[PDB]
Design a protein around this ligand. Structure first.
Ligand code: B4P
Ligand code: B4P
Ligand code: CA
Ligand code: CA
Ligand code: CA
Ligand code: CA
Ligand code: CA
Ligand code: CA
Lengths: 484, 484
């Protein structure tokens, strides 16, 4: 009703601008943004701003306007923030005030040129000697999911989302710097693979027409990264997007940004210290402090993370459990059923134990926590432990009740890797469509030999969630997946 | 072959290492890499190295060995380069030399701990007080396509490809640094879109199971990035991978790295000077000079690039052309046929002129050259010129006979964009499967209004080709697409 009246009115105004000339001038140039004028002239008296004649030009969206009849006050908005404009009838060229400015609408992109002063409240404002219309907005300035469908409106309105994504950029940059300072080289491994691997999930399938070849979207860079380690890049990492067919969730998006790093001649303890130093560095550089407020909790990243094994977490958060039930398939299956887990025919003992850990523990790990000693069945790419060959040297890394990152001592054994891939093929035959495939090339690389290597990966979106006080992954991803 | 016999021999050795204990020790740590020891102690004679007892430990692949019977010489290779080891029988623990060292094979991953000295030739060497086998290579040390299929072998053998990809990493880092210094914010936009756009090519199609939605792989970030410029991020860029269904060519890969930047309140001339400053800066920082040797040519990036229009290039590289034939559909179609272009029913006049430019000109542009004044038919997202509504303000930027990047003043007109989208849908209906789709959401964003904006994009792989003296894109991409 009233919205379509605005649409017709503004549309007819744009058409009138077409009538008389150029309605889309691209020639306007600005020498300043609001955040710069604030970061410089915020604390200066109107006496110093009057003696120094400082002319600036800015451009942005017109957010608010108050017309007082030959003097008007405008709120202008650009990347850095808001700056205030003083629009005077007799301080502009003839007719600009009455025949142009007063006919503009909120949301139109304009630009202004004037001298700096401060109002009676001490606010920095630009007395306008020139004002003109760069673009005419056809819709006026702006349920809970509409923020995610049209993110431009969310960015225009709420500054919390703006700060969230700016913080995301700053965090990514700080991560690249923290990795480079330690001697790691950032690479680009294929995003489209013939054989997907490196994790367990449903891959996306597409078709390459020129080669008539069905290819999968990457579920993990892992195998190609370790191939590059065989090549002799012994400190390597990739921060890039992986694709999984799983589905939408608060913690899940079909395409997400992940970091995977690998350093030779190290084990997973080095990656524990590397993780703690990573979060301490991002906490100090990105925000203010090692103490980060998240929801109803406070994370202290100057404090070492809590370390537990998987069985220690199961027994910790379910003390009534008999730990002998985890040494037998039938008792473990009965236990998992008692929790409410639906067991699959393809599941072995280790998988049942791990799922029991998922239902019992994961939701209770709030403070940052490392979970170690995973079974070999659910860790096909991880190095076997020396004392207990049925478990691998591995850890998953949890913050705020969700898995953040994953790291392990990589398995450089060729025959063992091939055999566990065989097990994964058997599992895929048994109905588990998240199971990996058999990759013969990676086995060949391991036969050319892979130095003892540790490797880590971290879902970046989860991390930025933790640092922005954002409780949904949709708040931290610019254009997440929707449900039409 | 004799290769398989040695392979079985190494496998038997590895099994013997399983028999007597741990065959995959991960506990060895190194405090130095070869490039560090070279960057420090290369300038010191054996007199200074004798007074200072400097003990270092290194680890890496054993490339060469000469066993002289209680004295041996080993070349060790790691990330930073090669370093030489002096393995003495009586300088190691008992049995290490005879029962272990002499049984190792070339390519095995080892580690050494010793004191620094210089041989009679001045070579920096590590006298080994300890040596042990970290990983046992099951296959011995290694043109055509083998380099591309197995890249660990290429990186192990050829030191040229190594520093090719290292130069790639350093270039990418320098590009992010060069963009951040100018106020651009790096951004992540979807890799999977419901409606692909921003370019013309066959997209990859896949299926999301949870949403029962068929989705396309990104052919360009453009639409989402400009959406974010509407949101108020007025300097944005994305360096990330785009997917197109094309084929394997010298200049083509199905998945390739792209940079797309957008700055509001600017036109394409600002992007021309931005590009020249970009290549001059990268050339000075990475290669130490403005003059870059590529093949048989020398590019000078301290020199401004050559500027031509499209018709000026058609007439320059085909002077017998009558430029009136490009103003009429039948004359232009007959002309393109005379060149050998196969015209399609969906092609209009501007398309014919652009394809004539491609056949006549592109292969002849060796020195960096800007080509301006593109027709609106092949530039649906570009702002129309003021004097000639049938052409748009746009340029494509060529080096070494290939296209590198393209940039234009973006089209902020909503109705015009809608109409050009309509024409692209008509083109798809007319048989052209590279034509775009109709994106209603982007039109909606343009109706919320997009400030006057200029935008650019650059194939990164082509650029790294120019800076590595690589004449195929396969040399500059770690794992390119192969033919099974
Ligand atoms: N489709 C779904 N819908 C609803 N609930 C689901 C779900 N899938 C799992 N869950 C929940 O998770 C619990 C246990 O299932 P898991 O499969 O073990 O947990 P996960 O969160 O999916 O981590 P995963 O192990 O699979 O990824 P990876 O380390 O290889 O990779 C390393 C890092 O990558 C990140 N990551 C993985 N998948 C991601 C995704 N779709 N989106 C964003 N980040 C992701 C993670 O931070 C991870 O740490 C379940 O009980 C369930 O509640
Ligand atoms: N599959 C094929 N096989 C054999 N010959 C072929 C071929 N395709 C084209 N050719 C030859 O090239 C000539 C001209 O064709 P064009 O289509 O005009 O040249 P192009 O290299 O394909 O640039 P394009 O137009 O597609 O990219 P865009 O501006 O959107 O902007 C994207 C930017 O990113 C880069 N880029 C685009 N696609 C890329 C890819 N697969 N790999 C690496 N970089 C790519 C580019 O620098 C580009 O500027 C043809 O006559 C033909 O001889
Ligand atoms: Ca999962
Ligand atoms: Ca898990
Ligand atoms: Ca995991
Ligand atoms: Ca193309
Ligand atoms: Ca073209
Ligand atoms: Ca092009």
């Amino acid at each position: 009703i009233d919205f379509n009246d605005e649409l017709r009115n503004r549309r007819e105004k744009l058409a009138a601008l077409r009538q008389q000339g150029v309605a889309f001038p691209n020639d306007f140039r600005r020498d300043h943004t609001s955040d710069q004028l604030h970061e410089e002239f915020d604390a200066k008296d109107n006496q110093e701003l009057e003696s120094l004649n400082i002319e600036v030009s800015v451009a942005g969206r017109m957010m608010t306007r108050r017309i007082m009849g030959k003097a008007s006050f405008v709120t202008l908005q650009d990347v850095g923030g808001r700056i205030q404009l003083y629009v005077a009838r007799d301080s502009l060229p003839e007719g600009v005030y009455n025949d142009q400015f007063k006919k503009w609408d909120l949301g139109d992109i304009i630009g202004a040129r004037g001298t700096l002063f401060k109002t009676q409240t001490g606010e920095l404002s630009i007395h306008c000697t020139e004002l003109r219309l760069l673009d005419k907005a056809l819709r006026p300035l702006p349920d809970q999911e509409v923020r995610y469908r049209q993110r431009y409106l969310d960015l225009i309105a709420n500054d919390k989302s703006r700060q969230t994504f700016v913080v995301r950029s700053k965090i990514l940059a700080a991560i690249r710097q923290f990795m480079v300072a330690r001697g790691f080289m950032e690479v680009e491994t294929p995003m489209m693979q013939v054989i997907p691997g490196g994790a367990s999930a449903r891959p996306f399938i597409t078709h390459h027409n020129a080669l008539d070849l069905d290819m999968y979207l990457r579920i993990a860079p892992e195998l190609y990264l370790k191939r590059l380690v065989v090549g002799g890049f012994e400190r390597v990492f990739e921060i890039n997007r992986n694709f999984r067919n799983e589905g939408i969730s608060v913690r899940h998006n079909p395409e997400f940004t992940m970091m995977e790093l690998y350093m030779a001649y190290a084990d997973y303890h080095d990656l524990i210290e590397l993780t703690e130093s990573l979060f301490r560095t991002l906490a100090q550089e990105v925000l203010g402090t090692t103490k980060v407020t998240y929801g109803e909790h406070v994370f202290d990243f100057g404090k070492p993370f809590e370390k537990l094994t998987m069985r220690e977490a199961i027994k910790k958060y379910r003390p009534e459990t008999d730990m002998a039930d985890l040494d037998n398939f039938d008792a473990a299956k009965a236990l998992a059923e008692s929790i409410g887990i639906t067991v699959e025919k393809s599941w072995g003992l280790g998988r049942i134990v791990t799922e029991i850990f998922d239902e019992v523990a994961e939701a209770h790990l709030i403070q940052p926590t490392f979970i170690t000693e995973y079974p070999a069945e659910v860790s096909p790419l991880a190095r076997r432990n020396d004392v207990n060959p049925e478990i691998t040297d591995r850890f998953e890394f949890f913050i705020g009740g969700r898995e953040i990152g994953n790291g392990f001592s990589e398995l450089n054994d060729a025959e063992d890797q091939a055999e566990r891939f065989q097990e994964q093929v058997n599992a895929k035959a048994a109905g588990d469509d998240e199971a990996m495939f058999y990759d013969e090339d990676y086995v060949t690389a391991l036969e050319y030999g892979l130095p003892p290597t540790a490797g880590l990966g971290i879902g970046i979106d989860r991390m930025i969630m933790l640092f922005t006080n954002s409780h949904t992954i949709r708040d931290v991803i610019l254009f997440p997946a929707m449900r039409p």
